[PDB]
Design a protein around this ligand. Sequence first.
Ligand SMILES: CN1C(=O)c2ccccc2NC(=O)/C1=C/c1ccccc1
Ligand SMILES: CN1C(=O)c2ccccc2NC(=O)/C1=C/c1ccccc1
Ligand SMILES: [Br-]
Ligand SMILES: [Br-]
Ligand SMILES: [Cl-]
Ligand SMILES: [Cl-]
Ligand code: NI
Ligand code: NI
Lengths: 287, 287
Amino acid sequence: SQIPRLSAINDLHKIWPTVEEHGAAIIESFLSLDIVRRLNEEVDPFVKIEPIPAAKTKDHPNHILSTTTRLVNVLAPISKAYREDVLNSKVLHRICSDAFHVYGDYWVLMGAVMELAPSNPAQPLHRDMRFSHPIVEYLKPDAPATSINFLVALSPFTAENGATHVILGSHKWQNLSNVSMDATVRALMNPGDALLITDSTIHCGGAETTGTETRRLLTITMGISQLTPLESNLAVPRPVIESLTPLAQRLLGWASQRSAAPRDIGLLTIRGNSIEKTMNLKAEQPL
Amino acid sequence: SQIPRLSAINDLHKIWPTVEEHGAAIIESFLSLDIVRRLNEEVDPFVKIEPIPAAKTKDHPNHILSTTTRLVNVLAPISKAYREDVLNSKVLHRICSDAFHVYGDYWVLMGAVMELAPSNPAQPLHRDMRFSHPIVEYLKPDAPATSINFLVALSPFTAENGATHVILGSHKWQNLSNVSMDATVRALMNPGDALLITDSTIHCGGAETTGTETRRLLTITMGISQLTPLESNLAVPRPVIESLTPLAQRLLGWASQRSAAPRDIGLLTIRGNSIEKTMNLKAEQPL
Ligand SMILES: CN1C(=O)c2ccccc2NC(=O)/C1=C/c1ccccc1
Ligand SMILES: CN1C(=O)c2ccccc2NC(=O)/C1=C/c1ccccc1
Ligand SMILES: [Br-]
Ligand SMILES: [Br-]
Ligand SMILES: [Cl-]
Ligand SMILES: [Cl-]
Ligand code: NI
Ligand code: NI
């Protein structure tokens, strides 16, 4: 049986319950083709200049991604489409509040464009967050997901060009002795479609077999505000931050956060007041 | 049997193993009387002006602390003694690296001065982190502590003036039906002594019974860099940050962090580079 497909607009209330059950769901038209085109245009040059993941020039090398992979994070200052349209997506926020209501506020752990060159090999079958958040390995087996990953297609995903593999139900597996490429199904997607998985869903990038096709995706890891993001927005110029909505500012860590505890005392506060009140942080100030 | 007492200097290697076993240990002369006096002097006026914890002026009210309690956090910009001496304490860093090596880097979740007025009632017996980090309630029972709390005496702790109660062994309790003030022992301390507990140690502030004594403490919650701090240093002026050591800057969240994962990809990074490299962040620049 295949990955369930849901309409971003008509099936909005079914998306999280479907992922909680099956560990994966494909959201059709998660982003419009306009947003996809504007995103591709704004990030294009940054993909071209990006060194290899484990470049000796970096003090935080990624030794896991293949040398024919380019990853570009901290998209807020590069892309107006990302910081305005993607960060304020009504679909993303309904799914995240459905998923994370038991914990409280959520933010972006990483928003990155990944481009995978022709003849890129299949990734090993894995769960996300194991190279950054060892704490998630100590959660009780039946603990609600603390992070989820929107894999948004910025180019076509096909069986031939290395569409994502997932194992349905694998987010509930404790015994991993049935893990095999034989147990997987493929996330076939048009640009703007998104594959939504949890931090427990076993998956991998597929093998590029055409030898000519370049595959590109926008990976948005959304997590509870209690977990530290993989990326920092500390160096994002303040005029850019002040052009965002209050909601977008919170997702980038430029606001105080709240837990779901009945008498929550909050996160990233300043003597009982918020970051935004303290710094007198402006919102929606056009550049 | 009483809370074990250890010398900051001669018993340094025994401090964490003692806490891991008993759930509490008193560190004699954790801070020198010089540092204690300079800290008290620099924070004095900020204690006097601080409103009630649940003041209607605050957008993050603390509804749990008694109205005869004052709490002041974000100490870096107030106190030179805190930002230079306390943040670079060789004792604190040996204990934290002993406690958190399985997880990776650690930082300050909150450094606060608490002052409790005459006739302040005893707090209810509790574990810390339940009003900010509901995620810790979902960790496996035998998961290593993700945060620890140094309760540093800034004034004398006596049975009469409301010295902390702890239940020894309570950090390993799953059944909480033996929780009673009858099961507790007291943390009797001179200024500069510290009571070290885990996030699982059941404890409470004692009742002030003299009706004249004001009790003051410096509470430093140290946690794995994977957990979000209760306080923010985002608004701390950059000249102050650039006067700190590289280690102190990391503890305040003004640097990238690393997990203990063999091929760690890191936390708060910028396209494979650190905050400090990216922003060209200076260190130990005197004001
Ligand atoms: C290493 N690695 C990443 O870099 C990565 C990239 C984008 C988004 C999340 C992310 N986190 C990971 O856990 C990850 C998994 C992974 C595992 C196996 C093979 C290749 C990747
Ligand atoms: C509410 N509360 C705090 O404010 C607090 C204060 C200082 C340091 C940590 C801290 N975190 C807590 O979990 C906390 C516990 C607590 C429980 C019961 C009674 C009074 C306090
Ligand atoms: Br993929
Ligand atoms: Br106390
Ligand atoms: Cl890869
Ligand atoms: Cl109190
Ligand atoms: Ni993955
Ligand atoms: Ni406490």
